[PDB]
Structure 1
Amino acid sequence: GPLGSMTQTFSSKTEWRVRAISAANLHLRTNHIYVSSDDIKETGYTYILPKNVLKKFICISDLRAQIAGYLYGVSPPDNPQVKEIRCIVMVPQWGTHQTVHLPGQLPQHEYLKEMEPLGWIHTQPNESPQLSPQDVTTHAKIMADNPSWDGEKTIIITCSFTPGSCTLTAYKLTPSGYEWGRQNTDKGNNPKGYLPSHYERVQMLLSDRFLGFFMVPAQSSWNYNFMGVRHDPNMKYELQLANPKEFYHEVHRPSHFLNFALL
């Protein structure tokens, strides 16, 4: 009965600190990256992902809050069945462990005009046998708002944090998947009507033969996970040819610095 015997004082232990410490160890996983062997084995297109931008994408990420990048690339000269991913575009965004929130506006930049959009890559805390329904919905609503996203050519690459490593798997929607996802308003983990026939695996290969590059916003950075109120589905942004800042870089969390300074 410690009304006046034992009294202790609460000492704040904020969670982003543990997450920032663990984000500093992400480089170790870039040496142990695994691609899944496709169950479909044939879906017309084989996607080739350059390792340099993949490793950077892992390094700038976080183990709880999903991040996403947009995929751009082309076919090798005389081989239209292969899609080489040449660019990953980072746009203003925030996430949770279950999904990413991106603007309505798709990347627009002259420097990308000779490339075609190939979909998106996003990190995931845990591996999973199936494509998330959040992902099916996200991809179907992008498709419905943007006719340049061909259902037969745009993919979701999931990058899952397996212990000590990263495991990559690539998917595409089916027509039924597009139809279900574009009308789905249920954000939970088991929305009515979701089925595994809404997607199929695609062949993906990591390559050291060529290098990809990044584009990032012209006027901000891409990470809004600490400035959520300033992120809006309608926000507009331009892009520049530069490499993205890591998740916990100072410019992504100004208020940590200022609020300490007021203490």
Structure 2
Amino acid sequence: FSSKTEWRVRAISAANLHLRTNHIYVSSDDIKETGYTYILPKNVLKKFICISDLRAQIAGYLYGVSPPDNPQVKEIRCIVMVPQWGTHQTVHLPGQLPQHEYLKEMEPLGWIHTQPNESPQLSPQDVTTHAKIMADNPSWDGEKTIIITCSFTPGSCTLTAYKLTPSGYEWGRQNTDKGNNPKGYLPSHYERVQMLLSDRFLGFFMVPAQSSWNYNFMGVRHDPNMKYELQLANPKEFYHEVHRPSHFLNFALLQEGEVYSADREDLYA
């Protein structure tokens, strides 16, 4: 990235992200009709979209449960934001999976990440990331976990949910190429699951304890094997001050300043 004025223009653009949060579209097609249904609370959805950014992709883990006497549906009741940095086509999450007392009761259901532009197909990077996560962690069930993509269409956010088929799981686990068009990536590796929004309950967030989540301005400090402890709070915005300590710290102190300064008494104080 340019890192000189590109970030400034992107911050100016991202300041208006709360406008997108009222034109939301859901893709309801190709649904197999046999798998689970998923219900996402609009409060956490709006918070995620607001804290997101146009170009860089952000991602967060979903935790949820099934409502009593209705197991074929899953309500998403928590989102976890973890130390991460992402490019315009991938997100570099840490190896450590989230772990906390409150999360001990819910069941991981996958992850949700942004997309700078819409693509009618799940990307090879997304499928391989999900496959790697599932393989490394036995907790992720290949039938319950999904991936939710929020693509920034003109003045709107389009949400679509995808499930990983066993063929996709095997291909992702065996794969190593990180390019845009890896060999053996087929449209039979994933299938679309039914998701919908709901105003009838509220989810919450969980962020890291010691530091913040975003690392795009502190990438050199982001180690995939880094160990972090969770905390119950709300996430900051993408361009928050704490997320870019570089800009706010690299100034210089005052040495023999204010010497020739204008003499104006603070009469009121």
Q: Which residue of 1 aligns with 2:82?
A: 91
| Alpha-carbon distance, 1:253 to partner | 0.1
Question: Structure 2: 5+ residue runs without aligned partners?
Answer: 255-269
Residue pair 1:38, 1:202 contacting (<8 A) in 2 also: no
Instruction: For 1:234 and 1:110, locate their aligned partners in 2 and report how far apart those are by CA, in whole Å.
Output: 21
Aligned residues: 254
Q: Which residue of 1 aligns with 2:200?
A: 209
Kindly name which structure, 1 or 2, has the bigger radius of gyration based on alpha carbons. 2
SS of the aligned residue for 1:55 comes to helix
SS of the aligned residue for 2:47 comes to helix
Q: TM-score, normalised by structure 1?
A: 0.94
Question: Structure 1: 5+ residue runs without aligned partners?
Answer: 1-9
The alignment yields a C-alpha RMSD, in angstroms, of 1.9
Alpha carbons of structure 1 residues 19 and 174: separation in structure 2 relative to 1, 3 Å: same
- Report whether the alignment pairs 1:62 with 2:67: no
Alpha carbons of structure 1 residues 11 and 195: separation in structure 2 relative to 1, 3 Å: closer
Residue pair 1:43, 1:203 contacting (<8 A) in 2 also: no
Q: Deviations over 1:65-89 (max 9, x none)?
A: 0000100000000000000000000
Alpha carbons of structure 1 residues 210 and 261: separation in structure 2 relative to 1, 3 Å: farther
Instruction: For 1:138 and 1:116, locate their aligned partners in 2 and report how far apart those are by CA, in whole Å.
Output: 19
| Alpha-carbon distance, 1:44 to partner | 1.7
Q: TM-score, normalised by structure 2?
A: 0.92
Percent identity over the alignment is: 100
Name segments (4+ residues, structure 1) moved above 3 Å: 10-13, 260-263
| Alpha-carbon distance, 1:13 to partner | 4.9
| Alpha-carbon distance, 1:262 to partner | 6.7
| Alpha-carbon distance, 1:257 to partner | 1.1
Instruction: For 1:171 and 1:104, locate their aligned partners in 2 and report how far apart those are by CA, in whole Å.
Output: 22
SS of the aligned residue for 1:97 comes to coil
Alpha carbons of structure 1 residues 256 and 148: separation in structure 2 relative to 1, 3 Å: same
SS of the aligned residue for 1:261 comes to coil
Q: Which residue of 2 aligns with 1:147?
A: 138
Alpha carbons of structure 1 residues 61 and 261: separation in structure 2 relative to 1, 3 Å: farther
SS of the aligned residue for 1:168 comes to strand
Q: Deviations over 1:141-162 (max 9, x none)?
A: 0000011101100000000000
Instruction: For 2:29 and 2:194, locate their aligned partners in 1 and report how far apart those are by CA, in whole Å.
Output: 6
Instruction: For 1:199 and 1:237, locate their aligned partners in 2 and report how far apart those are by CA, in whole Å.
Output: 31
Q: Deviations over 1:80-137 (max 9, x none)?
A: 0000000000000000000101110110000111100000000000111100100000
Instruction: For 2:231 and 2:2, locate their aligned partners in 1 and report how far apart those are by CA, in whole Å.
Output: 43
Larger displacement relative to structure 2 (66-75 or 179-188): 179-188
